[PDB]
Structure formats: C-alpha cells, structure tokens
Amino acid sequence: VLPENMKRYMGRDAQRMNILAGRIIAETVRSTLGPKGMDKMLVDDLGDVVVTNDGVTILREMSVEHPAAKMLIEVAKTQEKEVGDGTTTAVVVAGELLRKAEELLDQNVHPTIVVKGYQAAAQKAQELLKTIACEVGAQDKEILTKIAMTSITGKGAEKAKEKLAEIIVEAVSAVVDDEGKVDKDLIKIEKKSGASIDDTELIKGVLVDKERVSAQMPKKVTDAKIALLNCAIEETASEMLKDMVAEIKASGANVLFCQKGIDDLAQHYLAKEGIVAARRVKKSDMEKLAKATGANVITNIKDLSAQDLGDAGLVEERKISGDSMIFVEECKHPKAVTMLIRGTTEHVIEEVARAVDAAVGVVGCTIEDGRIVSGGGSTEVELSMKLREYAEGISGREQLAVRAFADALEVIPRTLAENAGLDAIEILVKVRAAHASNGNKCAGLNVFTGAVEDMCENGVVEPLRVKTQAIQSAAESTEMLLRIDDVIAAE
Template sequence: MALAFDEFGRPFIILKEQEQKTRLRGLDAQKANISAGKAVARILRTSLGPKGMDKILQSPDGDVTITNDGATILEQMDVDNQIAKLMVELSRSQDYEIGDGTTGVVVLAGALLEQAERLLERGIHPIRVAEGYESASRIAVEHLERVAHKFEFGPSNLEPLVQTCMTTLSSKMCVQLIPFCDTSWNHEPNAVNRCKRSLAEIAVKAVLSVADLERKDVNLDLIKVEGKVGGKLEDTELIYGILVDKDMSHPQMPKQIENAKIAILTCPFEPPKPKTKHKVDIDTVEKFQTLRKQEQQYFDDMVQKCKDVGATLVICQWGFDDEANHLLMHRNLPAVRWVGGVELELIAIATGGRIVPRFQELTPEKLGKAGLVREKSFGTTKDRMLYIEHCANSRAVTIFIRGGNKMIIEETKRSLHDALCVARNLICNNSIVYGGGSAEISSSIAVEAAADRYPGVEQYAIRAFADALDSVPMALAENSGLQPIETLSAVKSLQIKENNPHLGIDCNDIGTNDMREQNVFETLTGKQQQILLATQVVKMILKIDDVISPSAY
C-alpha cells in the first residue's frame, strides 16, 4: 500500500495488486466487523447457563469433542475472519486469567456490538460510542464492588468454596449426564446435584492442599488430573500423592511397598556409551567373556549403589534392559521405568526427594519418602497404575477421574479445571457476587441510572451498555425454556422495587429468584474481568474503519 497525491495535492492510496484485494471502508467496514463478532457470540449464546446446550466438534483427523465450555468450542473452531479471531482471543484470555466465564464474556461482547451497530446507524461516531462504553464499564465494575459479599473460610469451613465451585460445575455436561449417583450425600435434593457436590468438594480439597493461605497463592501445577476409561463418574477420587500410569518393571516385583524410600533417577540402568564413534573387535571367546563380565559389573555397581543408600524403590526416567531388570528383581529392589519428566518433578515435590542425574551423586538425603506405594489394576484389562500415597510433603495431589468413555473424561477434566480456577480465585480474593444473571441486572440498573449524569452523546452509549448487560440474563432465561423478555422484566422490576441486587433468573425452576437462597455464587474478579475484557475488545473493533483483505476465489 502506498500514498500518492494528484495534481491538486489531494492524497489517494495505491494498493499493490489491488485487483486481487477487496476493501471495505467506513460504516460498511464497521458493520462487517460487528456482523463477524455477533456471529461468533450467537454460536456460544445457546451454551450459556445450567441448561445450556452442548456442541459437537470434529477435528480434521476425525477426533470428536462434545462440550459446552466456551473456550474449548472457540479453540477448536476453524475461524478465518480476523474479527472472529479477536473473539476467540477474548475467550482465551478470560480462560487464562480467571478460568471460568468464557462463554459469558463472548455473549456480552456480542451484545455490546449489537447495541453499537444501532448507535452507528443513528450517526453517532464510533469513538463517542467507545468512550461511552468505557465510562459505563467503570460504573458497572464499581457497582459490583459495592454489591459484593466477602466470606471467611478455613479448613473447618469449606462450605462457601464448595457452593461456588458447584455453581461453576452446574453448567457442565459431566454433571448433567449422571443418571444415578451414590445417595450418601444429603445436602442436595437430587442425584445429579449430589455428584456435583462430590466433584466440587474434590476440587476445593485439592486446591487447599496446594494453597499457601498466608500469601494467598495457589500453584495449580501441583494438582495433576489423570483419567482412566471405565467405572462410573462418581468413582472419581482425590489422591493425596501422585498417580503414575506405569507398573513395576518386572511382574514378580512386590506390588505394595510400605514406608518406601524412593530413588528418583534421570540416568539409565545401562553401561555408559562413548560420545564418539567407536568399534570393538572381539575375535576370541575370552574377550567376549571379559566384555560380558565388565557389563555385568556395571549393572552390579549401579544396583548396589541404590541398595547402599537405603532405597527400597527406584523410579527411572529411562528404560533398562532385561539383564538389569532381572538383577533388580533378584536383589529385591522394585523399579519403575519410562516415567515422564513432569511426573518425576511432581514425585520429587511430593516425596521430598531430589532428582539424581548420576549414580555417583546418590546419597540417603536425596531419597524421597512415601508411606505407601501400591500397584492397582483396573477391571478385566491389564491396565495398571502406581499410587504413591502418604508422602512426606502432601502439597502435590492427583485427581483421578473415571468415566464411561473418553469424551466424558475429557469434558470432566475441563470442568474440574474451571472449578479449580474458581477455588484459586476465591483464595486470592474472597469476594463473591450472586449468579443467575443477578449481578448483570443489578449493574444494568446502576448504569442506566448513571447515564443521566452525562450530558453529551455518550449517554446514549451508556444506556446501550445497560441494555447489553441485560442480554446475559435474557440468554439464561431463553436457554432454560422460560419466556425471556417476560422473565427478565419481572426480575428487573422486582430488583428495583425491593432494592435487592441478589434476584436473578430461576433457571433450575426451584421456585425462588433469590440467588442467596439457591446458593448460586460467582467470583467478583471473574465477573469484573468479563465486563472489562468485553469492553476492551468491542472498543478495538469499533475503532477499525478500513479493512483490506485478499479477495475470495
């Protein structure tokens, strides 16, 4: 693209290979961009809330994913349009920062774009719309601070954390698919909610196990999530230790070791190999016997070093051949081979051991300690896994998911990731707002009331922002099979009449609109982040007034 001037000094743009490009300018460009953003939001709108629908996505190599997680849907969609890609990035940034609310943030951005389109058609300049949206987002975020509640929690009072995680899990496919569950839970009225509660409790206990409550910091890398096809979803368990998808290297090695002292090695059980090219000529039997004895001596020394420092279990990153395996079994030293680097690090953190790169550096102080190491087999298959439990440092934990098929396990992993992120956010900032669209309706009323204080054209944009906030509760009502406009109007008028910001959409048809009674919570940081991120992306889209793209063939 180049800028040139005609004989009267008027500038014009010369496009290179312009016959192969298409160009949109001004209002047409803005409408095309808004249309692309709205199309993405429309796809996710039906997935919002506890009664949201699921999407089935097929990858080019035939893998099928069934999910209603906004970030996953957009991640796996093949999006070409640049504005649609911005919406995908929006969902991804919400996922990275908060972990939950990935669908809601895209729905809100789509509604803001829809309202902006109407304002642009009336002749309001896009910059004034963007400024109005910025002012409205500040009003909404400040209002959420005012209506938020703080709650105290601790090892003896986990209920607020569990209830918030249950709100997150309520829209997930994994808890909607369970037809029957263990009836030992008496907190909730039906079987699905009982299973939802058990998953929420697992998530909360896992986060508290790795949390540093004094610094208000949580390292989610210490929580490993493993899945195995087979069993029921309610067989999902939390292991205070590490689960390794490996078995003992020899079938005759003991399957259970108590008070294990673990040597964690990244060096292989085999003779050293020179780095240079080499050739060994063996022309007599004696030379072969000498070489064999030397090799055997290497294996002997390696095993003896492990025995001398007091190790009762060897976990090795690399493999070892049959001779070393036989020798380990013969010397009563159980071993596990081909363990991945990430798993080795978690085992070292959990057991308090050190990863040893050379046998010469092995000392008793570098051994990890675990109360129980056991091998467990599953069903009629020969699948076996290694449980490392009662570790010296229980700050590394594993959530072990069971399920009827691979798709349910993958969706449960995504759901638990959201629940873990929500629990982490609450530990970092223990402020909550109430869900069911109540926060959006309350913010919408506050923004609408504040619009009168702005004398300029921005007040139209501020009122449009208030209308866009209403789209989230309206989508919730629509997805729950309720009359959307009628339901939203009733709840909104009730909020204004009673001055109660906790009234929302009764998606589960419990009989009350008060979200405090329904125990539907959401994190304050997650809700504020939704509003701020959606506003930023919409401002960016509104400021684009010229689109030059390759023409379609």
C-alpha cells in the same frame, strides 16, 4: 490495488463486515450458553468429528475467514488460558456491545466517543462489582462446596455435584497450605472406566500411569523411600552404569522414578537390590511425585544423596480396568494429590474430568480473593442500575455510549432465559424489582426452578474475579474492533 482474490472493506463497510464477523460467532455460541443450552456437531475437512458445547473448542475446529473472526478466535483462546469457563458469556457480551456500537457508528458517533463511553462505564462497572462483592471465609467448607457445585451445574457431572465438590474442596485445602495461593497443577485429574460416578475418589498421593520395568522387581513396597532422577540410567560400560545404581542403593532408596529410560543393565541391578523402578516418567509426574513424597528431584545421579529422598507410606502397582498404574500414597505431608474419576463410560469420566478442573479453579479463586458475588444475573442488575445513573453525570453525547454499555449487560440473563424457555421480560421485571427492594444476596433468577430465587440461601455464588475479568476483557475487545475502519484481508 490488491491482488485479484484479496478483499478490502472501508468506512461503514469495514464496520458492517467486522461487526458481522464477531456477531455470527456470538449467535453461534449463544445457543450453547447456559445449563439449558444445546451442543454442536462439527465434522472437519479431515473427517474428525467433535460433538460438544465448549465454545473455544468449536471455534478451534471451525475455519474462520474474516480478520475479526480470527481475532475473536485468539480472544477465545486467551479466555481459555485465563479462566477456562465463562468463555461463551464473554463473547456474547462483546457481541451485544458491538451490535449497539454499530448503531452509533451509523448515527455518526465518532469511534473515540463510543469507546470513551464504554471505557467509562467499564471502569465504573468494575468498582460496582468490588462494592457489591461479599466477603467470605477463604477456607469455609460450606461456601466452598456451594461455589464448587454452582460451577458444576450445566455440565454432565451436575447429577453427582455433591460428591464431586466434596473431593474437590478437600483436594485444594490439602495442597493449598496457607491462606493462600492455589495452584491447580498440584491436583491431578485421573480417569479410569469402571464403577460409577459416586465411586470417584480422592487419593492422598499421586497416581502415575507407569509400570514396574522388570518382572523380577517387587510389585509393591511399604514405607517407601522414593528417589527422583531425570537423567537416563545408561553409562558406557557396565561398571559405570552399575555405579549409578549402587549410589541409589547407598542413598537408602527402594523406589526409583526415572524421567528418561532405564537400561536393562540398570533394571537387573535395581532388581538385585530389591529397588522397584519405573522409567520414561512424564516430567510433570516427576514434579508431582516430588511434591507428594517431598523427594528432591535430582539431575546428576552423583548428586543424589539420602537427604534427597522422599517418603511414601505405600507404593503399589495396580490394574484399574486392566490398565496398570502405580499408586504412590500415604505420604507424610503431600503437597500434591490425585483425584481418580470413576464411571461406566470413558466419555462420562471425560466429562467429569472437564467439570472438576473448573471446580478446583473457582475453589482456588475464592480462597485467593476473599470476595464472591451472587449468580443468576444479580450482579449485572446492580451494574446496570448504577451505570444508568452514572451516565447522567457523563452528559453530552458521551452518555449515549455509556447507557448502551449498561443495557448490553442484559443480553446474558436474556439469552439464558431464552434457552431456559423463561419470559425474558417478566424475569427482569421480578428480579430487578426484587433486587432493588431485597438486595443482591436476595435476588437473581434460578433457571432450574424457572423463577426468581434467593442466590445466597441456595449457595449460587461465584468468585468476584470471574465477573471482573469479564468486564475488563469484553470492554477492551469491543472497543478495539470498533476502531478498525479500513481492512485488507488476504484470500
């Protein structure tokens, strides 16, 4: 029926292939899962080599063949857009759910029954998370730095997580304003080699990677009046161009950031009026500069007025590790800040740049949603404990899928412990028993001491959102795949 080379699978063969496609990825990424996991070395067809522990990156670099494998790739990219972290975790959960669902498919349990039990258990699992969730202060310094550092662990930056969390919590609280809504785009992640990690510092302003367009212009100005124009400064005839610059002067501006280019004529007139200028500014940085200075970005140069100017205490061109960059800082009320990452190697400060993104993320999540939960698998213990009782109310054949869903949740604590070198059985015997007796804030496994610990006393908590997103995404991904029973895949 199909062109020679095109493949088709159907019934239990479509199910075997599609389950394997995802299950192989799950096995590939679950060895990188956790702080005590490993990393992977991929050399592509072009020779470009990537060495990392990032799940989605590995999945973007490799070339997948199966339709289910490519779907999982899209899921990994969706998770990358939504949360960034917890990607590997979500894949592994889905992998286990698929492993168990396949057995039910062979047992002649109709896909509409299997997905019914999963949909039922997942709906209860989310309610269980919302119930066990602990209300915390959105702006509480202590828990913010505890959440922050918890996120940092298992990353290269964990060695200085105390210094990192400090500037990350301050960065968010600086720009967040009310309690609240957090936009990670207001905090720039800059990295420039030199010094060490402890020297990483938050700058109350914006660090842009631009230079002073003319040798005749000042290299630093104080009590700066910033003008933001996205229109290039070049007009037919020198009189018309000069008019544009004359308007900038008239506004009272002495700093000029142009998103586009600045003609040599404009650089000459700007320099004559003592106005410092930087051209070809990234649209993003034009916007962050507006947020920091309070400047009103103008398109039409004719529309620029004195009322559109923003303030900066100091605007200065500095060479950091040789690289010339402009520091715009000491603004009255900056709504955007930059964190300058320091370190002895570009790859180290690159790793830190990865870590601080997640740190801001989860600090943002816990401010927007005032509920957090214990880490170390303490949540999933509560979920499986109640979901197993939930299954009992379901009855019929349907409870088989509900029970399988609940059991599948243990694959994450189980693999984490396998990578930690901990007894998969014992830690569950001790943690789960400790959960039942002492609660959720008095349990969980800490792989860093290699024993059951108190998550709350150790500050090992994460935003509720993290856990509830995983349940929704993993469940609907699994239930979808399970319904495919006839696939035709092009070579």
